[model samples]
Target chain A: SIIRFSVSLQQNLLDELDNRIIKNGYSSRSELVRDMIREKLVEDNWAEDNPNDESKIAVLVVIYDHHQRELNQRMIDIQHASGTHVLCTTHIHMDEHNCLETIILQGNSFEIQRLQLEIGGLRGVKFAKLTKASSFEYN
Target chain B: SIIRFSVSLQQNLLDELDNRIIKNGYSSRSELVRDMIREKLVEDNPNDESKIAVLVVIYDHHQRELNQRMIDIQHASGTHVLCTTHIHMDEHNCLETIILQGNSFEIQRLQLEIGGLRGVKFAKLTKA
Candidate 1:
């Protein structure tokens, strides 16, 4: 089945979209719109999956103050509590006072989520993001 | 000028917002919302060719000696990789991010080659 639809919007908004389309090198409006919709679908799909599922993979990124007292140890404690296999972690000194860390994890999604929440909630942690992926099975 | 506004959103969306507020350690919704808006503005700016960037990638650690391939390619590529960090996410998966300083084209080229290797799951770059 195939269908088409038209959207009514402001001229400036349309112009902005057109500008982005060219900048991103999209072939046409249809291609850009299709990709946008697909991105939303993937996000919703991840939200619907079981958080307790062991097959889930997550990448957690964080930026934090390097001198925050006890922050480093607390992060490690939560990781140990989760009991999930932390596949790997890479840390870089963003500046003299700040650090950037990327932690990759596998096993129970709920545990991973918990750890993410815990680390993110810590004082001095500036930015935290969790990117969840189940598989590459795109239809 | 400072303007006050209101957002009409579903209860579920509000709940999620509250949760994020706590998790991110934001003292108030206003602070969080302000930061989010600022981030959007930063993203809208034009990409600078001569800038520092951090590129993160996820791949299978066991795929066709991809580890060696990565090191070789970075050394072969003219772009300066300031530092590279590697983490093992699982038995099979490896997560690596490189701090690179060079033109956007050179960085993008390096990213493409690394991402093209077999078993790479995701690759993304963020301007620093």
Candidate 2:
């Protein structure tokens, strides 16, 4: 079933939306609205995962000093010990002294996040990020 | 000027280093090391007027009603989306990752808005 409702907003807000539709080229406000809803659905899904455990969908993009003692090896070990499947990984040598690696992983949301925290804690890993995700849907 | 130095670590460590270097097509461990450093600097850079971040989510395509709700939200928000890539991850899951670059505050708030909807699960963000 579908229902259409009315909305009353300040003129400024309505003007802003008008600009976005033209500037961003959205087919209609309807498309934009749907995307926002699905986005929230994903956020709701994260709450279902055990916060204290290790099953988080994580994509780790890390940058570390390669010269640090045992830093590289430690990162690799963490990935292995985490027991998450690494779907894809890309590494780049940005310059003479650093390395950037991005790893897409599927696992328990909680554990994966903990791993990110641990890895980021290392002296070698200057920046570590976990892109959160899940295997469920909102609709 | 450039200098080269050699040091030793456990065999396991050395093996991991060698593997990543070759797999990622780096010339040597030094290259990987340098890149990592730069990557860190960028992530640490405070989000200013312009910074790119991506929000990935999985939602129910069956929530036909929420589709209308979704439209209402974006229309009312200030954040501007660069692009949205959508996919059918399964029969029930619709995956959409939206890329948007904006002021840090706006981006964060936009994410919160998206995350608060009825059908969204997993509001993941990647920023650089």
Candidate 3:
């Protein structure tokens, strides 16, 4: 059985990894690691990383200036584009000038992060964070 | 008759109070002191029984036995570390983002412990 896990390293080790990644011109941090993983796991585990098996859930909390034009509508468009599956969203008027929205969404990890990056990178957005969640659901 | 209560204070305290009134951009000391007392009253109450949090930690890689010891403490902290993502930041620093769930008080305690550990350059928590 193939096991997927994250490695924890600090400071010098992390730095060297980054430097090599840059010098070697990799796409992303995970990209380089994935390649190495692919090399060893080449023996084949039956391509289990298909989107269906990559089920993940996360919480996206966004704080933004309420006065921004068409920003709310744009957020909806990105979710629609990604075919994001959302449980529900709670919005709070943090103050006269700001709104905070917490949205729970489930999808492949790739889609979820893309959704977060698009929405979080909008104008007048003060803070946006995607916190990963466990698959465990309460009955 | 409604009571128009009056209070007495030592001049030293009064002088410091006046300084704060100006520093805080309040129109008068009474307005400023009212807000202070209001928060104090609310502080008597409590909140946040249990919650989830994101803990971001940056530390040095060269420190002795830190990576092993730091994680050992987390698993035994009465809180669950649900997921963790690690990225190489620079030649000497690593960013570790950990997700934890537990009682709010215990979460705070765990964050404090991680924040104080040796070789940890920085640690911050965002509770949701």
Candidate 4:
């Protein structure tokens, strides 16, 4: 069921919001508010809400220099050793020197973060970021 | 002056919002909603506006003079560097976030210039 509620804010803040609504192409104020709340819910869930270690997911994006011979192998070494299921990897061939890859993994949150840290430690790796996520079965 | 606006949400979502208010320790529904809006505003603002921003740069610290160049680029951008926090992922990688406020174009330009450096692996900008 959908319900209505009132939110009060400073006048200047409201003006900024209306500007953002137009800038970001939000259809309505309610729609934007809904998206904001939805994102927060996802964030809260990713913060270890499930003690049972359910199948949570993480997307790890990395950019690295392929020219360093040992770097590529070491990254794989860490991935193979980590007790996580690296579901898939999408490799973008940026050049002979640099390769951009997105690796998706599903497992406990603790090890998911550890995997990213291990990969990020390699000499050839330029940038690494972990985007955390979980199922939306909000109760 | 403060103004009031009406928001219609799904019943379950409203319940979830209240739940988060308790979990996240927000003082009131309005306060949480206000933060959400403010964050959205910062995340999407344009070049003409001056706003606080965060730049996350991950790089190989072993790269000769990368640290010097990193500071150089930010210094040359003429943006205010509010603060910076650093973490060493290991002996090779350094993860740093630089907080600053400036013109959007200049901030993004700093990102591009730093990312363009040979050993700098990744540079990303997020509005704060």
Task: List lDDT for all candidates, in order.
Answer: 0.63, 0.57, 0.58, 0.70
Cα error, residue A115 of model 4, in Å, equals 2.3
Candidate 4 B-chain TM-score: 0.61
Question: What TM-score, computed on C-alpha atoms, does each candidate reach?
Answer: 0.58, 0.44, 0.37, 0.57
How good is model 1 by TM-score? 0.58
**In angstroms, how far off is B45's CA in candidate 3?**
25
What residue pairs clash in candidate 3, if any at all?
A11-B92, A11-B93, A11-B94, A12-B92, A15-B90, A15-B91
RMSD of each: 11.2, 20.8, 23.8, 14.6
Displacement of residue B79 (Cα, Å) in model 4 is 32
* Candidate 2 residue lDDT tens string, B86-117: 66655876666665657765666666567666
- Binned by DockQ into CAPRI classes (incorrect, acceptable, medium, high), candidate 1 is incorrect
What TM value does the first chain of each candidate achieve? 0.72, 0.64, 0.60, 0.76
- Alpha-carbon runs more than 4 Å astray in model 1: A1-17, A24-38, A137-139, B1-44, B47-54, B60-80, B85-95, B99-119, B126-128
Mark the 10 consecutive residues where model 1 chain B has the least summed lDDT.
B1-10
Q: Report fnat, model 1.
A: 0.02
Per-residue accuracy of model 1 over A2-37 as CA lDDT, tens digit each: 234333333444455567657655446444443333
List, residue by residue over A9-76, the lDDT tens digit for candidate 2. Answer: 33443454445445433455443333333333334455556645544455677777877889878877
**TM-scores for chain B, in order?**
0.57, 0.57, 0.61, 0.61
> Per-residue CA lDDT of candidate 3, range A17-107, in tens?
4564565444455544433322222111212234774445456777788889899999989988986687656566656887767666767
